[PDB]
Amino acid sequence: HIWRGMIAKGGTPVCCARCVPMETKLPEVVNCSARTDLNMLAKHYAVAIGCEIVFFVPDREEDFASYTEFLRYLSSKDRAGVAKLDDGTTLFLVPPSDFLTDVLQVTRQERLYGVVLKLPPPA
């Protein structure tokens, strides 16, 4: 049982997608309801105590051109997308860039990363 669903931008479908791990349940639709500057995410990362990652791949070939285009839509502007898991956790949609190696310090891949940051809990 793999995750298979849709990605959307502002409620507007972008493509269908699947998901390989490196986590809670992904909704049927991962909607990118907003963007965040990579700088802003860098600040949350600096203090995070968990950083979980999945890769989103286009589901089928007909989803490729859109997936690719959605990557440039994010990386152009040095931004990341914002979506949610089922349980309300913030999920960031991070396209390929230096940010992946300099800040998250992970291997870089020409893939969209889903990223959840766990910040410190209260005392």
Author numbering: 439 to 460, 465 to 565
From the paper:
Recently, the split ends (SPEN) family of proteins was identified as RNA binding proteins that regulate alternative 3′-end cleavage and polyadenylation. They are characterized by possessing N-terminal RNA recognition motifs (RRMs) and a conserved SPEN paralog and ortholog C-terminal (SPOC) domain. The SPOC domain is believed to mediate protein-protein interactions and has diverse functions among SPEN family proteins, but the molecular mechanism of these functions is not well understood. FPA, a SPEN family protein in Arabidopsis thaliana and other plants, was found to regulate the 3′-end alternative cleavage and polyadenylation of the antisense RNAs of FLOWERING LOCUS (FLC), a flowering repressor gene.
The crystal structure of the SPOC domain of A. thaliana FPA has been determined at 2.7 Å resolution using the selenomethionyl single-wavelength anomalous dispersion method. The expression construct contained residues 433–565 of FPA, but only residues 439–460 and 465–565 are ordered in the crystal. The crystal structure of the FPA SPOC domain contains a seven-stranded, mostly anti-parallel β-barrel (β1-β7) and three helices (αA-αC). Helix αB covers one end of the barrel, while helices αA and αC are located next to each other at one side of the barrel. The other end of the β-barrel is covered by the loop connecting strands β2 and β3, which contains the disordered 461–464 segment. The center of the barrel is filled with hydrophobic side chains and is not accessible to the solvent. While the overall structure of the FPA SPOC domain is similar to that of the SHARP SPOC domain, there are noticeable differences in the positioning of the β-strands and the helices, and most of the loops have substantially different conformations as well. A doubly-phosphorylated peptide from SMRT is bound to the side of the barrel, near strands β1 and β3. Such a binding mode probably would not be possible in FPA, as the peptide would clash with the β1-β2 loop. An analysis of the SPOC domain indicates a large surface patch near strands β1, β3, β5 and β6 that is conserved among plant FPA homologs. The first surface patch is electropositive in nature, and residues Arg477 and Tyr515 are also conserved in the SHARP SPOC domain.
